[PDB]
Amino acid sequence: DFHVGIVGLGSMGMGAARSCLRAGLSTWGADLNPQACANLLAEGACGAAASAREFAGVVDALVILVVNAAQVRQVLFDGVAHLMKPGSAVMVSSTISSADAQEIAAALTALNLNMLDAPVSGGAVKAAQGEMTVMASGSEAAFTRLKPVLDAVASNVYRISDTPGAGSTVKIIHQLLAGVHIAAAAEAMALAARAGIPLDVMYDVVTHAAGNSWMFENRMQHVVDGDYTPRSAVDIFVKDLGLVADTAKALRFPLPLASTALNMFTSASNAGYGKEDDSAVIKIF
């Protein structure tokens, strides 16, 4: 049978793991959250532990859904890359630089492993339904080996290039929009509040008009409900928009709006809202 290990059981990771289970793949999970692991076991997983060292040696594919490159490197190099069998594939689905994706791929290739630069999007709901959007780049060997996984976790896979790096570049550009949209939504709702317009009313209008955005609809519900419990933290976009900034600077390209959004999220973090839901950026107002 096909064995796939999912490392990182956050909202996106759990969705992927459940989608793999529905697809009938032998699924293993790894996360420091004992409750995420227990749920997966209760749902049919072959195994679930704090790390993937217990099953890395038998999986045909390992999917890594973590926050940053540092965490990807920690999972791979108590690392598990050296335990993986020749020909197995590693699908890196985080938000890293093109350089890091290439550096990581080179290290894995040396171990006769295939890597797919495959950052994802689509939201937690879509993920739970196996309807992720994947922006991937990598060898034919990686794409072929991971087909069972991609078919299970995703509904839209975009093959950007045949070499690691391009996928992460696309993800970076995508995060520019995600970040700016959250900040713009916050700016508009704070103005609405200041103008005396009920936020629930403002929310309904926008979500039924031409000014709507996926991020407005998703994040501004948190604002209307006054629930800043972190789904995705402010600090995530401080990091992501920082990566966007670096990419643009390397290309000598100006970012009027992305630089502004980065400053807004950065202000929200210095104000102490760094670990709160990213919609908390509205608090700088």
Add this chain to the structure above:
Amino acid sequence: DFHVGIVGLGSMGMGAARSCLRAGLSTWGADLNPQACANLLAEGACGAAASAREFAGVVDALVILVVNAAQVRQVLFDGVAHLMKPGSAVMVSSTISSADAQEIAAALTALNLNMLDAPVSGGAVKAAQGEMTVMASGSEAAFTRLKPVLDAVASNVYRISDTPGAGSTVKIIHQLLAGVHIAAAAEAMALAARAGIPLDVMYDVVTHAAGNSWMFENRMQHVVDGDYTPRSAVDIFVKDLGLVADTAKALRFPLPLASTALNMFTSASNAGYGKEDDSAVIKIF
């Protein structure tokens, strides 16, 4: 029967007129475009001319879908307000200040006419299907008189307040999002181009990911196709974001992103792209 006159047969206006015709209302149209008028006549309109002076005296309701307050005032005060019969209603669906909506309403009330501060949104496609989103405020008399029209042209009507002004305030906030989203989309696509990512590919990814926006999906298709033929001009947002700026300043409220977008559209206009599609803001890059 119920007679309704539609003044301003642009994309939104034609949709409203056709929706009124489908609803079985006696429909009249007014626009300087002889081709818009001819099409309406061919479709069953009672009349269609350059101005509404020919039918203003018999309509139960007059809908004004124009670009700005100046044009609303020109239609009302060769004006037609004084020709309208007592009890008739005027639905102003433009993008004007709250002050202007109130000033215009007062003038119409003095003539025993009802006015509805009813700016709209939803896009041309929705408009043609009678599925507009209306953010309206005004008296019970105005809402009641216009019900036949609202039922025909709209699918979502939000009654903001019982007095003219609030509707326009909501529209202003909405335009902040519409404007920022177009500019953010342009910024992201220009960066994508600079980074060497095919725009059609970047478009497909975004429109299937969490960074999508109604404006990105609508306007960036123009960019992918390289067609800057004006559907809605750059100068429209120079005007609209200018109104947003004034609203915020009056409230002593800062707009990091909206002020940036205004500067971008303003730059695009000074560069000579003012009359081109608003997606042409991408040309400042």
